[PDB]
RNA sequence: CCAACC
RNA sequence: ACGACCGUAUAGUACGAGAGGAACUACGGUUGGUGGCCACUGGUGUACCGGUUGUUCGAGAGAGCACGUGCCGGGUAGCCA
RNA sequence: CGAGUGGCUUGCUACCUCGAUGUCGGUUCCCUCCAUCCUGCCCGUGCAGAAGCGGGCAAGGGUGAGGUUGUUCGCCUAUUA
RNA sequence: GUCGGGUGAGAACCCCGACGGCCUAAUGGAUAAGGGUUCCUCAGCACUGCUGAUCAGCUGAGGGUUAGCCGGUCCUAAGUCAUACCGCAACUCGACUAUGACGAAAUGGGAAACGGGUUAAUAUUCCCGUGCCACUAUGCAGUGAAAGUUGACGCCCUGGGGUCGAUCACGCUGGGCAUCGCCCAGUCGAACCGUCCAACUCCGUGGAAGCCGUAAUGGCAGGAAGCGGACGAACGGCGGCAUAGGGAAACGUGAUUCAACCUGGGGCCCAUGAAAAGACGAGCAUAGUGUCCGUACCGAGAACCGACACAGGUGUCCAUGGCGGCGAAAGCCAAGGCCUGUCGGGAGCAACCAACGUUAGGGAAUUCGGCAAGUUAGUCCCGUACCUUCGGAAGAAGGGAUGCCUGCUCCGGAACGGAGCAGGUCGCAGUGACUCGGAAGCUCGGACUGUCUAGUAACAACAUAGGUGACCGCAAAUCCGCAAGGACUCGUACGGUCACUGAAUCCUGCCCAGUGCAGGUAUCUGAACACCUCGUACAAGAGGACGAAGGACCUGUCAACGGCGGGGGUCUUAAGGUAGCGUAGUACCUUGCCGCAUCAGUAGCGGCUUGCAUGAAUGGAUUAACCAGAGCUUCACUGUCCCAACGUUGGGCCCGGUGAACUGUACAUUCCAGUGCGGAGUCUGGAGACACCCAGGGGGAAGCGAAGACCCUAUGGAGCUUUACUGCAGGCUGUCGCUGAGGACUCUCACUCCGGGAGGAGGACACCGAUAGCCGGGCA
RNA sequence: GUGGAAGUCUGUUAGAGUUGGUGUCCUACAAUACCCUCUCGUGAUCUAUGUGUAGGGGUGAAAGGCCCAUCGAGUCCGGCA
């Protein structure tokens, strides 16, 4: 059985959905974490310096 | 016996398998009595049809060269 | 490298862990205030799946149901003692100094209300030798000769099942349904079938160890494999 | 022979 | 677009003590290659005719499906060797 | 011992190609060379004949089937001009 | 698909009818996930649709999903999170321990709903009829109330009860067919309320010394059969429900086989097959309450994932429709669905290609190789070798039979179950299609079933049972973490950790010098702190004494790494290759030599064997059985071949419509020679050459596709190794702090461990912090 | 005779897999597809959902296999021009 294609067609399991804090679908529902915003994870909102070039 | 083994294993692997399960299911004299009546209902448990008396010993005796010894000293 | 197996085990994931949740309970011996004024009644035999041996389910009088880890010999309506006065006989528990010498016994404690440490396994038993007023010898099943406090408590007799492995798995089928039962990855693939990468033996043109199996105590782990501190090998000599 | 390394 | 060989007559002759044993020439055939043709033999021939298994159309009659003929037997034209 | 021709083998060189000219053997299909294996015509003989052996002209045509081996080559078998 | 017709400006593909077909575990019915309006209606065809389009999953506009009893909601599962506590420089990090919560929509547990009617689209939700559950109120009854029971459970064999379905018999209703008398359909009717009870268990009676009983096991004076009794089942029977509903009508009755569902008996485990909420226990009337969320549609060769209306992938139940037959097999056919695995028109329709049918004679000559194709085939009877671990080998092999019709026999309660007999009779052929093994021998490997390189490797590789060695008494061995702590472990030597070999069978020789591990060690060597000397008004520093582990040295150990030669009738470096096997999947020489087999055999098998360079758990030998594993031989068979032919289906060719991509410095009708960076359509010399177009097989463009995977070069990269360099974890060991009192010792008070607690064990050690020496590819 | 064991046999039952054709395809129906043949099919079996293990780390009956078309060290962004 094929890594592609034939792989493909068993996807039907929903893990990342619209959080409740940031409106973007990365709260996924299986870890009850959102990927986006750190809601579940963290009080303070996900964010990181290398969201950007490290001199702007 | 290791019948249902077919022609696999090897001699001695089926070998002890029969004895040991041939002394496994013969007729054992009932602590709780003195009848033959006592069968396997699992690892190292043993109940007597007659009497319904059911207890521990060996893994497929009802009783071990060491159990035997307890009741001496 | 890669970390080998021997130290993915003590991460205790999933594959390495014993199926606990099916584990039926821990045959520790019960706590007596003292007296010995504690007798129960053998209600049932089951089948405790953490040994591959009989367990008893025993009623005692103050209405406390348990399991105990039962001698070979013992059956349903049996009336067990535990105590200081408790009787000598085969299923009965109590203190070492109260047993008489040389008397098999099983479940022995480590020390005083441990609950049992010693000859728990498949028709094994501890040989009671030497009595005293400071020290209870007691030969384990390994042969070692152990010192122990009198007020260690035991059980007479010898733990039920045995025999076990008198007979042979025969099949690989056989182990499996065992191996399921204990916390332990199985099958087993030799270190020197695997890649260098993998493990200390692993590598080479045709399969061989690239240097000597006795390894030394010292060892980091990753390293230690093979034949660990052996003060010897082989059948010679 | 030969199709690389020995 | 023809190449080569075998056989017969020459002849048990010439030659040679013998053993052995030719040629010119005239013939018949085979083989390899070449071009064409189907009266003959052979193949095919899901044109066609027949036998027959399962199933469905109630039976009968007559048919469908079973891979582009269910299977089997025969085989015209044509095409072929 | 001396003098050469070929460019099938092998070696030598590193001129071409590393932004790639797919590598052995076989197979299929086509053209060619002659240093000629057979076939045509000759010369010599230690040429009686039959047949051998050696040499000359000559490239029109032919040079096949099989056993081991991937084999090339080769060893082997029965045919063959 | 075709013929007619309908609509429309327009019709091969939108609709109607007919005729012809396709799908049967699906191409039908219900659904989970997932999608998200794709559902229904009307109006449209610019977009999307492999052609067209009046059509549509497309565009525009509206509309559509109704619940006490179907899910959710409740419970807890593996397991997750939160808070407290603790660690961490710290946290959104981290293990344990408490507590709380979360965690199951087909498919775990679970209070209660059935039948019919209705809409364009919902429907156990709305409507009609009937019924049921929980809670609360009121009334009557009730003092019981928590013990127990249930929820609640594995795998294999099997009896009994029993509905649907299917079938058989006869009757009734309707249809079809038209030589007969056959063929098809229907013949209905729930939840619920009531009632019946087989099995199991038990009780009374009884009195078996051999009887009772089963498909089988089994049962009994510790009381068998028989007789009576208590308890006790179905999603089942029976009555109501029902002058409910439904049907044009009739609106049946019996039987067999019996999915569902109910209830028993047996067997297996080095394997033991959830939990909790809840329910029962624990009566009845009447009334009230029953909120909140989901509900359309697709569920796939167009609604999901795969960029697509993708030949892929994607769970569940319909597993009992008819013939067939062993069958949930093939083949054919219903119910139901479809003609959308969606471009058509034309040419006897050429070459060539993909699938495929038939080929005389020869019969593997083909080829690395029988690759491909074929041969055999179902069932019954006869018969069956070597070898063997006695299981097997075995369907060995080999031989014979097989339909139909008429009348029967046997087994069984019977089947629309099975086994036979006699007579008659047809074909080339009776497992007539379909379904359906070719067989035998020798050798190598691995014992076997099992595993694997998703996407070039299925094997001889990995696993395995079996054999073996190593570590560890549990405050352990092994392992994870910086720590707090953790796996193993609800475990305890019949354990479980670390390794090697790889079923059984017969065996497993010699070597401890080197390396490894372990033990010992008079003496030697061996760091730091403290101590002593010198030096410094101090300090740096120099030297000394003491000396742990470690090393030197000694010993043990090869189923520990590994080794088992050259020379002579010892030497290196410990030993000097034993049993076996042997030209090997190891032998260069090599096509070794002899034999077998063949016309001919670098192959294969047997034997010999000085083995370039076999050999014993780096396991040796051997081996029945097994194998999509490697090699060889034979019989059978055949288009593999001699040597090719004819045919079939789909393309190819022509026509309508749709309509890409690769590639392109330029020029370009070339050919023979030469030249040139030595492999030129383009330079030179000649030759040839009127332009354009169709079809073709691919000689050339050192064709297109990919900045060569080879090789080298770079003071390039990475993975891997080790007695390379240098370091870092980690372990051992000494010292200092924790740390107390009286080169050997006692004690208790810190601290540690065991204990529910009292208390017990240990104890200035251990743990932990710091440092010093040793080991240290485990890691960088 | 009964009984009905088995990592037991046959088997396109469901289901799982993939020996050969070095067939078809190879700007594909498809960035692993199609057909026939073939293997397994009561168990170390297959399968759905839930759940756990995370990057020098997992997971691995071991092939350097697998960890979302990516693995002799994933992916994303940053270091970074
Ligand atoms: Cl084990
Ligand atoms: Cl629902
Ligand atoms: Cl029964
Ligand atoms: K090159
Ligand atoms: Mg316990
Ligand atoms: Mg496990
Ligand atoms: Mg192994
Ligand atoms: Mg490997
Ligand atoms: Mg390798
Ligand atoms: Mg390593
Ligand atoms: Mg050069
Ligand atoms: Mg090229
Ligand atoms: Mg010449
Ligand atoms: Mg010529
Ligand atoms: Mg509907
Ligand atoms: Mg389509
Ligand atoms: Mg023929
Ligand atoms: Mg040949
Ligand atoms: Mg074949
Ligand atoms: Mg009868
Ligand atoms: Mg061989
Ligand atoms: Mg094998
Ligand atoms: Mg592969
Ligand atoms: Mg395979
Ligand atoms: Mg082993
Ligand atoms: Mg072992
Ligand atoms: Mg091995
Ligand atoms: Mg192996
Ligand atoms: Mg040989
Ligand atoms: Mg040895
Ligand atoms: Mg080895
Ligand atoms: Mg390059
Ligand atoms: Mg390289
Ligand atoms: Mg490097
Ligand atoms: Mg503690
Ligand atoms: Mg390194
Ligand atoms: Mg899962
Ligand atoms: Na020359
Ligand atoms: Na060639
Ligand atoms: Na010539
Ligand atoms: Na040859
Ligand atoms: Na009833
Ligand atoms: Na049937
Ligand atoms: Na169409
Ligand atoms: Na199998
Ligand atoms: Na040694
Ligand atoms: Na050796
Ligand atoms: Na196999
Ligand atoms: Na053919
Ligand atoms: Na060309
Ligand atoms: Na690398
Ligand atoms: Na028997
Ligand atoms: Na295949
Ligand atoms: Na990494
Ligand atoms: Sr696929
Ligand atoms: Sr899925
Ligand atoms: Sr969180
Ligand atoms: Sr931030
Ligand atoms: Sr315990
Ligand atoms: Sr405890
Ligand atoms: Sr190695
Ligand atoms: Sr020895
Ligand atoms: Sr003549
Ligand atoms: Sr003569
Ligand atoms: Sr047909
Ligand atoms: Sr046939
Ligand atoms: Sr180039
Ligand atoms: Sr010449
Ligand atoms: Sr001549
Ligand atoms: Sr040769
Ligand atoms: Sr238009
Ligand atoms: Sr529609
Ligand atoms: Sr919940
Ligand atoms: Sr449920
Ligand atoms: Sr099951
Ligand atoms: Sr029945
Ligand atoms: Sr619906
Ligand atoms: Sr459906
Ligand atoms: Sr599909
Ligand atoms: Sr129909
Ligand atoms: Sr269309
Ligand atoms: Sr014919
Ligand atoms: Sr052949
Ligand atoms: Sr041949
Ligand atoms: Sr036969
Ligand atoms: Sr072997
Ligand atoms: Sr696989
Ligand atoms: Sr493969
Ligand atoms: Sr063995
Ligand atoms: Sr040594
Ligand atoms: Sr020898
Ligand atoms: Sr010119
Ligand atoms: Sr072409
Ligand atoms: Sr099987
Ligand atoms: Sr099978
Ligand atoms: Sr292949
Ligand atoms: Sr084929
Ligand atoms: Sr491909
Ligand atoms: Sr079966
Ligand atoms: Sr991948
Ligand atoms: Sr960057």
């Given at each position: 059985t094929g890594a592609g294609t034939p792989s493909q067609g068993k996807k039907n399991t929903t893990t990342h959905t619209k959080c409740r804090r940031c409106g973007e679908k990365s709260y996924h529902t299986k870890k009850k974490v959102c990927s986006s915003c750190g809601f579940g994870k963290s009080a303070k909102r996900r964010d990181y310096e290398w969201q950007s070039k490290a001199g702007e | 016996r290791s019948g249902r083994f077919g022609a696999r294993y090897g001699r001695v692997s089926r070998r002890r398998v029969a004895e040991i399960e041939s002394e496994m299911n013969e007729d054992h004299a009932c602590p709780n009595c003195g009848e033959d009546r006592v069968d396997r209902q699992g690892t190292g448990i043993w109940?007597?049809?007659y009497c319904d008396y059911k207890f521990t010993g060996g893994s497929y005796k009802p009783e071990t060269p060491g159990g035997?010894?307890?009741?001496?000293s | 490298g890669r970390r080998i197996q021997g130290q993915r085990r003590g991460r205790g994931t999933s594959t390495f862990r014993a199926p606990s949740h099916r584990y039926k309970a821990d045959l520790e011996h019960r706590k007596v205030e003292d007296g010995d004024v504690i007798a129960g009644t053998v209600v049932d035999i089951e089948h405790d799946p953490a040994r591959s041996a009989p367990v008893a389910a025993v009623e005692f009088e103050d209405g406390?149901?348990?399991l105990i880890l039962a001698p070979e010999g013992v059956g349903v309506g049996d009336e067990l003692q535990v105590g200081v006065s408790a009787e000598i006989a085969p299923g009965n528990t109590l203190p070492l100094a109260e047993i008489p010498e040389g008397v098999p016994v099983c479940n022995v404690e480590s020390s005083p209300g441990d609950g049992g440490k010693f000859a728990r396994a498949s028709g094994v038993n501890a040989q009671l030798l030497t009595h005293?007023?400071?020290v209870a010898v007691v030969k384990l099943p390994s042969g070692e000769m152990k010192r122990l406090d009198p007020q260690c408590r035991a059980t007479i007799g010898v733990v039920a099942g045995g025999g076990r492995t008198?007979?042979?798995?025969?099949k690989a089928g056989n182990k499996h349904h065992k191996?399921?039962?204990?916390g332990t990855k199985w099958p087993n693939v030799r270190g020197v079938a695997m890649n260098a990468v993998?493990?200390?033996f692993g590598g080479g043109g045709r399969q061989h160890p690239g240097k000597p199996k006795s390894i030394?105590?010292?060892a980091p782990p990753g390293r230690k494999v093979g034949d660990i501190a052996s003060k010897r090998t082989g059948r010679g000599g």
């Open positions: - | 109940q007597c049809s035997k010894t307890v009741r001496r | 406390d149901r348990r005293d007023r400071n008198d007979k042979p798995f025969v191996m399921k039962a204990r993998d493990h200390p030394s105590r010292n």
